[PDB]
């Protein structure tokens, strides 16, 4: 009698099935798309969290082949200054994420507040590569219509909308002109969205439903939340993510506002390379479309 | 070979799927029905437990937009006096639950003992709004026939019967003239009904089976038991409850026989509003009929 | 590809669904059959364990309306003496289990060793009511052929065979002339049969498969193992057991070789009566055939 | 939308169903095949781990009726010397595993490194019985083509390939000429393959898929990983393993590079014999093909 749409799976419900392989971890390609217009050399994004991404950590992420999204828990002028610091950082890093001018890539988050138009303007004038319209509920008037507005007003900036967890949301963001979507609503066990609101979609099913909805559109999806180990990251990719956002795991690093960020990155990319080796996936498109899961009981 | 009627789900088996939303938590309507004849401004009832609801806590609940049910672990004259204190409390509280005379609403519990007729009479003469015929097993001769008797003898009082957990019980209460039913048998893990008697129905399935049985009748159902966080409350509503009863969570408050009851109420209603925001539900009827669950493994 | 016969359920996988009731716990009948020829006033048997049942505890069990099975971890002459002590105990206990001569009922266990014929003879000459051919694996030549032999050689004694856990075993025991079968192989989580041999059948499915196989034969089944609380006992009955054997739970009692056995009995029968009240079962035959389970996730 | 091939089961998801038995633990036969050409008197292999198998432990294993695989975390000349020590050990042990010359059997592991050809040559010249081409991912060019090469270059040595976990891998190894395959990828909960790479197949399903793929070929499979108790071992056999590899459980023994290895062996074989007794399996071929599982919830 309950209105149950499906059974939904998280990282711990599934394992990657090994497949034939002739490719070594060190030899696979980790190149992917952050957005329609933006490629990354590794599928790794740092979160728009005030304990995680400002200019220093965003610089390190771009140098590694990923990208940082500058958080929006600060003033407009501070946020544009963080963006400028990244875009002016003078560049040893053959993998760096860079724009057509050879400047490091950066993103910046915006919300739905009264200040959003002015914020987007200052960030775009500062040379931002991507504006991330980023709330706890991306399938909402505030997010979608803001994504529509950025796309129509600043047509040479990339726009990401999130956070979403359903096929329907992905399409509503695609129709608004989103160049990528970010996936993750209540993705961890015992996070405050589940406890407080009773709301959430287990992340492996969320990513897969959104990947299926977006197939053939050219719109990438970013998996944000619920990743604890590098094996989770591999699972997110096989479920259809184009890259993965990490937040609190980077929060203790030198670069954040325990050690170098580099170590953490290399360990995360190490496990992913291992998982590509096990599944026989030579590049990210193979990893996203070919390996299969087994479902497990957790016994 | 076992006589298993179904697999049944509790709060932890399910999450609310976010849906399109243009409504903010602060803007949704929490208006609902306690019974056929009685509306509440918030879907919240305090339990007929001797550590929870007497006149002081019942007053606070009515002022908040809900209602208190005075417990029956006391004498008949004490219980009527508790009711009178509520009905005479002189009323800053625009949400108050009130009768057609502007007096705060109150309920009172009765059992099946030899004293029930006299108890119901004293409570009705004291101006009670609702009589709650309330045992550990509402699908029983003692409860149903007592509900029939109150309805036939005092036709201007509202009557609730409980506790039940099945479609069949809901109908048997509806046929007896019940103006609402209360749902909850063995609703928590490791509660004494499960340990001692082996008896229970997981609460999300219980509420849904009873909501389905009652559809189109105009008879509301109250979810009583197994709610630990405000997210559980939201889930109870989506499963079809019209409001939710809380007991031990209020037991430490100033008003009960750690802080003000108000804080607890506002936090509980806060999470519900958040969950209505996430699901795009502007009012309680939307919340009860439109949002969907995903089933989770608990991995 | 695995040879999986079914998914099998234990006590914690299921709950009793409340049903219509007009019967109070105190008013239900607990009368049942231990065997074809032997009735008990309560469905409770004490185990043939050297820490549980000798003459003193067997006497108390019979006085309560159940029966004790004297354990076989002792000499033949000691075991016959334990039986004689019970049969001569002079009988305040209106519920007592008694034979056609007014003597308390007793059972005694035998194994498969070289001494079995002589043991059965001494026990029968001592006036035993039931011989329990009792090993860790009742579906075996040693048990079945011993049951056949007792039935053919001492046709005026009742014979129970165990322990079994399948339809096929029940039938093989019925064909050998067994007057009842005892059910329970690897019935607890983390018991030594599961850890050491990897062998076991969850007890709710075991009881149901054996009850289904025995339907219409007049052969009762005794549920032995995995019962921790009185609610488990109720579940065993609904799954089709005619009575239930308890071992280590009685091991600390005065009567065993923390308090009086009586307290434990009354608490166990209290929960069962409560469960009969909840399900509307006036007697044991109703309890075994009418109430239904819901399956639960354990979330 | 997820690419889930199946639900897959580990040891804790299943129990052996007892079946009719007239055979005692002590009387069953534990004779089996390690490879096409090699029989063992017990289905037990010690792992190619640097804390487990060198000449002393390999000698003890062969004397017990099993076999040791000498680990490859050492130099080529050291490994051939370990093999020679086993082949020259002068032989009280009626169960010993021996070649056609009366010398104890031994195996040795090789990897995929540049040194493999020279390693295989030295080991074969030292009189090795079986070469185990042994990596973390046997379904790979490095393993399969190395198995092909050993078979084509040294046609009088037995070759095992591993580790694998799928029907497809088993066949690819069979086609390369493998005389047996070794099964086990991410077989334990929380092992580093699952945490780091997100990769694994629950071991009962792995063994069954590989056994089904290999049926009628004459190629045995060895279950390697995830066995904690002797009951797990029995389950591995019923799922279709011909024998079972143990590693860290032997790591504390006298013979390894807490007590005698013998005790551990006898306890492991004790539980297996018990499980054969329960299921009525007189020999290993009966155990692999006849007993059935029940699936359990872990409640
Ligand atoms: Cl690898
Ligand atoms: Cl919200
Ligand atoms: Cl009751
Ligand atoms: Cl046995």
From TrEMBL, chains A, B, C, D:
It catalyses: IMP + NAD(+) + H2O = XMP + NADH + H(+). One of its GO terms (molecular function) is ATP binding. Pathway: Purine metabolism; XMP biosynthesis via de novo pathway; XMP from IMP: step 1/1. PROSITE patterns: CBS, IMP_DH_GMP_RED. IMP 1 binds at residues 189, 224, 226, 247-248. The active site is at 191 (thioimidate intermediate). The keyword Protein biosynthesis does not apply. It is an enzyme of class 1 (oxidoreductase). Keywords: ATP-binding, CBS domain, GMP biosynthesis, Metal-binding, NAD, Nucleotide-binding, Oxidoreductase, Potassium, Purine biosynthesis, Repeat. Catalyzes the conversion of inosine 5'-phosphate (IMP) to xanthosine 5'-phosphate (XMP), the first committed and rate-limiting step in the de novo synthesis of guanine nucleotides, and therefore plays an important role in the regulation of cell growth. Homotetramer. This is Inosine-5'-monophosphate dehydrogenase. It comes from Pseudomonas aeruginosa (strain ATCC 15692 / DSM 22644 / CIP 104116 / JCM 14847 / LMG 12228 / 1C / PRS 101 / PAO1).
């Amino acid at each position: 009698m309950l209105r149950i749409s499906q059974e939904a799976l998280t990282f711990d419900d599934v394992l990657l099935i090994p497949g034939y392989s002739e490719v070594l971890p060190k030899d696979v390609s980790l190149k992917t798309r952050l957005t329609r217009g933006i490629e990354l050399n590794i599928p790794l994004v740092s979160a728009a969290m005030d304990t995680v991404t400002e200019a220093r950590l965003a610089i390190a992420m771009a140098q590694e082949g990923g990208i940082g999204i500058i958080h929006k828990n600060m003033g407009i002028e501070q946020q544009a200054a963080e963006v400028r610091k990244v875009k002016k950082h003078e560049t040893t890093y053959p993998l760096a994420s860079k724009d057509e001018q050879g400047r490091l890539r950066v993103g910046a988050a915006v919300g739905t507040g009264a200040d959003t138009g002015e914020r987007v303007a200052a960030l775009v004038a500062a040379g931002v590569d991507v504006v991330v319209v980023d709330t706890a509920h991306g399938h909402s008037k505030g997010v979608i219509e803001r994504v529509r507005w950025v796309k129509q007003t600043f047509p040479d900036v990339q726009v990401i909308g999130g956070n979403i967890a359903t096929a329907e949301a992905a399409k509503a963001l695609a129709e608004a002109g989103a160049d990528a979507v970010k996936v993750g609503i209540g993705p961890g066990s015992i996070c405050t969205t589940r406890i407080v609101a009773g709301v959430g979609v287990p992340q492996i099913s969320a990513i897969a439903n959104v990947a299926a909805a977006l197939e053939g559109t050219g719109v990438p999806l970013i998996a944000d939340g619920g990743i604890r180990f590098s094996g989770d990251l591999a699972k997110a990719m096989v479920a259809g993510a184009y890259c993965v956002m990490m937040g609190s795991m980077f929060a203790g690093t030198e670069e954040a506002p325990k050690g170098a960020l580099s170590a953490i990155v290399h360990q995360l990319m190490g496990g992913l390379r291992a998982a590509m080796g096990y599944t026989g996936s030579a590049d990210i498109q193979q990893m996203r479309t070919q390996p299969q899961f087994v479902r497990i009981t957790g016994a």
